[PDB]
A paper describes a structure:
The Interleukin 17 (IL17) family comprises several structurally-related dimeric cytokines that are elicited by infection and other immunological stimuli. The preeminent family member is IL17A3, which forms homodimers and can also heterodimerize with IL17F. IL17 proteins drive and amplify inflammatory responses in a wide variety of cells including keratinocytes, fibroblasts and lymphocytes. Here we present a new class of inhibitor molecules that interact with IL17A at a novel C-terminal binding site.
To recapitulate this direct interaction on the other side of the molecule, we next substituted the other amide in the linker with an ethylene glycol to make Cmpd 10. This compound gave us an X-ray co-crystal structure as seen in Fig. 5B, where no major changes in protein structure/gross rearrangements were observed. Isothermal titration calorimetry experiments with Cmpd 10 showed stoichiometry consistent one molecule bound per IL17A homodimer, where it gave affinity of 44 nM. Cmpd 10 also showed increased SPR affinity (43 nM) relative to Cmpd 9 and showed inhibition of IL17A/IL7RA-Fc interactions (IC50 740 nM: Fig. 6A). Cmpd 10 inhibited IL17A/TNF stimulated cells with IC50 1.3 µM, compared to a much weaker TNF-only stimulated IC50 > 50 µM. Subsequent molecules further increased affinity to IL17A (KD < 100 nM for Cmpd 10) and importantly could also block signaling of IL17A in cellular assays (IC50 1.3 µM for Cmpd 10).
Numbering used by the authors:
A (entry chain B): 44 to 49, 58 to 125, 132 to 151
B (entry chain A): 44 to 56, 64 to 152
Write the structure that this text describes.
């Protein structure tokens, strides 16, 4: 137990819309948490968008996750959580 | 100023990054004055994206995906706080974007 003294690009980025594996954000709010609001990505399609603007289901939209530090009120407890931050397009086999 | 229970935290030293059409490499961001002191950040391998033939198509863009994250910053011992909470940006991977539509 220690004493701790206490700009988001998602407010302006457009990759979620122009990606071949686009996504949308879901608001995760917790007033018992710092940060109080985090935004999690959910891939928009199963497959990926091809050059004709159609979903190619052989390719796979998958979410990229990042482990982040959060504070949970207890005075706080330091914890780690897994957040989906965007999606990428993968081939199922090389 | 708050009181943080660090509980069981201690310092430490999928293959999408390769199968993606916008593949990336991870680079070591190290700062002994920070917790976590090491963060692995992505840097896209190419300006373009990989096409069905396995070559790079530069009319498409590989771009990094960023996440704002909390980190602990070391405070001098003279200070009543052990740590200083900060926000930094980390690239977690890359995506392939079209530069223009239609
Ligand atoms: O097995 C597969 O097929 C395989 C496929 C891909 N990349 C191609 C690909 C990606 C995604 C879907 C299909 C793909 O291929 C389909 C068959 O090819 C049709 C040919 O198209 C020409 C090129 O197109 C691309 C080239 C690069 C990236 C994305 C695309 C296609 N998307 C696209 C193109 C364009 C453009 O303007 O061209 C515009 C948009 C667009 C984006 C967003 N909103 C829109 C809205 C409206 C209109 C367009 C859009 C999307 C890589 C690997 C692979 C991945 C990783 N390691 C390896 C390999 C393959 C081999 C070895 C290793 C394997």
């Amino acid at each position: 137990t220690v004493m701790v003294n206490l700009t988001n690009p998602k407010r302006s980025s457009d990759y979620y819309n122009r990606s071949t594996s686009p996504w949308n954000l879901h608001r995760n709010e917790d007033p018992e948490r710092y940060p109080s609001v985090i935004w999690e990505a959910k891939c928009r399609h199963l497959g990926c968008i091809n050059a004709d603007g159609n979903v190619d289901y052989h390719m796979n939209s998958v979410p990229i996750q990042q482990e982040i530090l959060v504070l949970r009120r207890e005075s706080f407890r330091l914890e780690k959580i897994l957040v989906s931050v965007g999606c990428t397009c993968v081939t199922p086999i090389v």
